[model samples]
Target: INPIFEPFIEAHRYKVAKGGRGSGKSWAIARLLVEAARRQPVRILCARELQNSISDSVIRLLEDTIEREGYSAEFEIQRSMIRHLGTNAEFMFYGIKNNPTKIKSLEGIDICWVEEAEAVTKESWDILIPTIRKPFSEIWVSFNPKNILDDTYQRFVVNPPDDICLLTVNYTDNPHFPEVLRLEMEECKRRNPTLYRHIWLGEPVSASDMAIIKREWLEAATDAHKKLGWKAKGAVVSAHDPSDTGPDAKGYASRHGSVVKRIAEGLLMDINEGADWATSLAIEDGADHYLWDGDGVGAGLRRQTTEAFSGKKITATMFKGSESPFDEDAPYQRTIGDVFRNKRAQFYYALADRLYLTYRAVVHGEYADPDDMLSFDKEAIGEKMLEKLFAELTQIQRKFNNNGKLELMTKVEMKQKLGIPSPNLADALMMCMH
Candidate 1:
C-alpha cells in the first residue's frame, strides 16, 4: 500500500482519496479494509451510486486481496459477500440510489467504502452519511474527479468537512504502477494534454453548456489529420494577433491544409517588435500567406510587415474582425444576413463547425471530408501551449443579438466576466478561417 494513505488507518471521520486512472487508491483501500476485518469483526458496507449486481461492487477486489494476503483460510468468500470466519467480520454491498432505505435501516456499519463516488448525488450523500452512525465509524470515498461542480468534488475536495483526510494521488505516486498502463498514459499525454490533465491527473473538467467548444471535442481534434490518413497539402497560412501592451500576450499560429502546424505566444510591448517577431516566424515557416488582426495596435503591423515582406513572395493580409462577414448575403444555415452579426462571429462559428466535424470523425467513426476537419500538431505546438489554446477556445460563448443573429462577447467582456486572459491564440486561429 502507498504510504500516502497511511492516514486511512487512523481515526478520521472522512477518508477521501481522489486521483487519476491507474492510481492504487482502490487497491490500497481494499487491502486496508480486508486487513482491518481480519484482525476484528467489522461491518463494512461497499456502495456506489448505482450497482445492479454484486459484480458492480468491490467484492472481487476484496476477495482478491484476501487471497493475495494469504488470508483465504480465515475468510469465507460467498456469492455476494465476504466474512472472516473467526471474528465474524462481514461485508455488505448496496446501491445508494436504489437501496437507500436498506442502507439507512442498517445499524453499526463500522466502515462504509463509497467507490466511484464521483457519480454520487447530493441526496444520496445526505442519506449515506447519517446512516453510518456507529461509534468511530469511518466513511471512505475513492473516485476520479469529473466536474468541479459535482457534489462529491464540491463536498469532499473543495469544501471538505472537519476531521477529514483528503489525499490526491496519481499513477506517479504508486510504487507498483504497471508498465502497460504507463505506456497508455504517456500516449494520452502526447496526444491530448488537456484530456490527460483531467483523466490522468485528477483535474476537474472545466466546461459549461454555454461553452462554444467542449473539452472532449478538442481532445478528438488532436492528430485528427494523421488518424484520418490525410497529409498537409495546402498553402502554409500563418496568422498573428498582436494584442496591446498589457497582460495579454501576442499570438501567432501557422497551418497547412487541415493541420495546425505551430502556435506560439509571448508578450511584446512595441508594435514594431511584435510585427518583427511575427514576420520572422512566418518567414521561417515559409508561409504562403500571412494574416494579422488589425483591430487596435495590430493595425501598425500592416505597415511594419509590408516593409519587412518587401522582397518575400508571401501575401500579407490585415484582418479586421469587425468587418462585415465574407459573402454576407450568402445563405448560412438556410438564412442570409440573419445568421452572423459580424466577421468575427462568422469565422468563430466556422471554426466551431470544423472542430465538431473533426470530433465526430475521430470519436464516433463518422466520415468527414478532409477539408472540413481540423487537427493540431502536438509536437509543434507543445503541451503547455496546446493546453492554453484549448482553454481559450472553450472560454468564448455564442451570444445572440436582439435580432437573433450570432455574436461573440468582446475580449474585455470575457476578461471581466469569466476572468479569462485575452483569447489571442483562438483569435489567431479563427482569423486563418478567412
Candidate 2:
C-alpha cells in the first residue's frame, strides 16, 4: 500500500534510504523484501554495523511486516533464518563487525539490508562492501542521518558511487502515520525546534551561540493561542515597516486582544507598494487603528496610509517620540526609560516579556491550567511562515551598550553573533504589540 519503496525495489548497487522517524523506512523495505523473496529463491542478508543479537537486526520488523501484510502462511520463521515455503528463499541475519573471515567467506547472498546505517563505521563498511561482491547483488542502507560528516553519509550521499539510488522520506511522506504521532510532531515543532528538525524533519543538529527569545516560550505561546481559541475583536491595530528596492522585508500585523497576528508580512517593497498591500489587509480585517514608524525613509508611509484609508474611518498614529508608555515606579521591576534605549527597544522588550511570562508559567508546569496567552491560525499562518516567525521571535539577541543601557541586537548583529539573520517579522510584531 505504501509506494515509498517502489524505487528501492529495483536493482542498484547501493540503495540509501534516509529520513526521520515514522517514515515507514524499515516497514516498507521489509514488506518489499518479503514479497520479492516469495517470487524467487533469494538469499537475503539482514545486517547492521554491530548487531550483538538477532533482536538488534531487522528480523523482528521482517516478521511483523509478513504477519501484517497477510503473508504469514507463505513464510516460516526459524531460529536463524526465514524460509519461504514455495520458493525456498532464505533470509539470514548477521552483524558486520567481528567475524571478518566468516563475512568474507560468505557466498550466494543476493541482497544485504543494513539497518541503523548511520552508526556504521568506516571499518565495518570497507570490510562488508567488497565481501558482498556477488554479481547483481544489491546492498540497501537505511538510517536517520546523525552527522553530515558520518562515513555512510559522506560515502553515499555527499560523493556517491556511480550505481547508487538515494531516497529521502519523512513523516509527511507517510500517509499511514498515526494521528497521535502527528500531534506529537506539532508539539515538538512548537517546543524545541533544534531537536524537532533533527527528529521530525531529519536535519542535523547545530549549536546555538545565543538565543534572545527562548524557543520554549514561542512554542508555549503558539500552543496556548491554539488551545484557548482566542477570538478576533474589532479593536484591531496594524503596524507596517517600509522597504526600499533592495532585499528588505516589510512586516505588517494585526493586534487582536492580547495576541497579535501577522496580517501581511515579508514583502520587499517601497512605501506605496507596502501601503497598497497593508491597506487591503487592514480594510478586509476591520482594522480600527494604524501605527507607522515615523522615522527616516519609513516616515513617508504615514501620509500615503492616511490618504488611502481616509474613507475607512480608522484612527492612525505615528510614533517618533522619546517617551515610553511604561512608568518608572516601584510596582514595575524595570521601567522602559531605565531599561531600553528607545521606543523601538521598549516595544520589542514588552513583547519579549509577554512571551517570557507565558513560557515560564506554562513550560515549568506552573499554573498547570492557566489561561492561554496567544492564538495562532494554522490556515492564516502556514508552517513555513510560522517557523520564520519562530526564528525571528527567538533568535534575536538582547544585549547592553557601552553605557550599560539596554541595547537589543539588530538583525545584522544577530547574524554576526548567533548565525541567525533577518528578524523582520519580529520587528513587525513588536510594532503591532503597541
Candidate 3:
C-alpha cells in the first residue's frame, strides 16, 4: 500500500480509490484489510463482478502478501477461509452476481472490499450497500475506470455523499512500478493516445459519453434564471417522480415564465418522507400547481401532498402517462412536429431537443445558422446535485421502439445499456415539464 492511502484506513462508510494500471490500488486495499483484521474480529467480504472459483478473486494476492510480510504465524489460510490468529478475524470471498438472494441474507459483514468495481452492476451495488449494515461497516472500492457513466463511478465519484473518502492513484504514485511494467505502459501510450489515456491514466471513456443532457444547457439554464431574477414570473408548477421500489425519489421545480427553478430534490427516501419534501418545495417556490406521476409509489405521494397542503390553494394534478397528452399549441410542436408515441416520450424528446439546441449553440458558436437556435433556461444552483441531474439527463436516449415512432428509452433499457441505476432525477425533471 502506498503511504498516500493512509486516510482510507478510517471509519468512512465509502472509500473509493480509482486509477490506472500498476497503481497498486488492489494491493493496497488488500493490505489494509488484512492489517485491520489483525486488530479486531472484522468480517471482511472480498467481492468481485462474477466469480465461480477461488482463482476468480484476489485470494492469491492476499496469500502472497501475507507470506511476503511474514504474517503466516499471525494468520491462517485454508482452502475456504483466511483467519487471523490474534483476533480470530475472518475474510470471506464471493461473487456479487453468483447468489444475489443469499447475498441479501449475508449478515455480520463489517467490511466489503469490491475489487474491479467498474464492472459491478447497479443492482449488486444497491444490494451490497444495505447488506453490510453492521456497525462501523465500510465499503472499499478500487477500479481502473472504463467509462465516466458507469454506475460505480457516478455513485462513488460523481455524486458521492459527504461520508465518502475518494482518491485517484496512478503509476506515478507507485514507487515500486518497476522497469518491466513501466516499459509496457509507455509502449501502449505510444501506440494509442485514447487507449493509453483510459488504461494508463485512468480516465473514463468519453466522446458520445452517453450523457443525453448537455452541461452547456444546464449551465445556460442556471445563467438564464440568474439573469431573470426578480422579473421571472408566471405559472409556478412543481412535479415529482416517485420511486416504484428501493427508495422514494422526489424532483421539484418551479417554472416562472421561461425560467424553471429546480427548487428541491430527494433520493432513496421512504414514500411519506419524500411526499412532505415535495409539498414543502411547492410551498417554498409558491407553486400554484403540484404535479406527480400518479402510479405505484406516486399514488401515495399525491395523497401525502394533499394532506400536507390541506386548506392551501395548491392544485395537485395526477399526471397520467400513455398516449400523447400534448396539444398542437405545445412549445415542442415547433421542433419535432408532434411525432411521439406516449406523453413520456413527448416530454423526453422536447427536453432532448431543448438541451441539444443549447449544446449546439454552446459548441457551434459563430459557426452555425441563427435559425437553429432554441433556449433552455434554468435557475442557478451551486450544489453538486445539478451535476447529477445533468448526468441523468445524458443517460436518456431517443430511440425508435416497436411502434416505429420516436420514443424514449425505458428505465430498464437504460440500466441494461449503461449498467446504471434508474434515472430518477431525469424522470422527475421531465415530469415537471409534463
Best by TM-score: 1
Candidate 2 has an lDDT of 0.73
For model 1, the local distance difference test gives 0.87
lDDT (tens digit, per residue) of candidate 1 on 1-434: 66888988989999999999999989999989988897888999998899888788889888888888888899887897888999899999999978878988998899999999999999999999999988899999999998786799989888989899988899989899899999999998886676788889998876766677777788899988878888877889999998877768889989998899889896744677878888999999989999998888787667778888889899999898788778878887655467888888888888999999999999899998889999998888899999889878988887658988888987877776565578999999898886
Q: Which stretches of candidate 3 lie over 4 Å from their true place?
A: 208-434
- Itemize residue pairs with steric clashes in candidate 3: 211-394, 212-394, 213-393, 213-394, 221-378
lDDT of 3 at 47: 85
lDDT of 1 at 45: 91
TM-score of 1: 0.59
| Candidate 2 colliding pairs, count | 2
> How far off is model 2, as Cα RMSD?
16.4
Candidate 1 regions exceeding 4 Å error are: 1-205, 333-336
Give stretches of model 2 more than 4 Å off. 1-210, 226-234, 266-268, 320-334, 360-372, 415-421
The pairs that clash in candidate 2 are 225-374, 225-375
**Candidates 1 and 2: which is better by lDDT?**
1
> What are the per-residue Cα lDDT tens digits for candidate 2 across 193-296?
66678887898532244445666677777756555444654367777655434576777777666555554565656778777887777777677887765654
Looking at model 3, residue 430 earns an lDDT score of 76
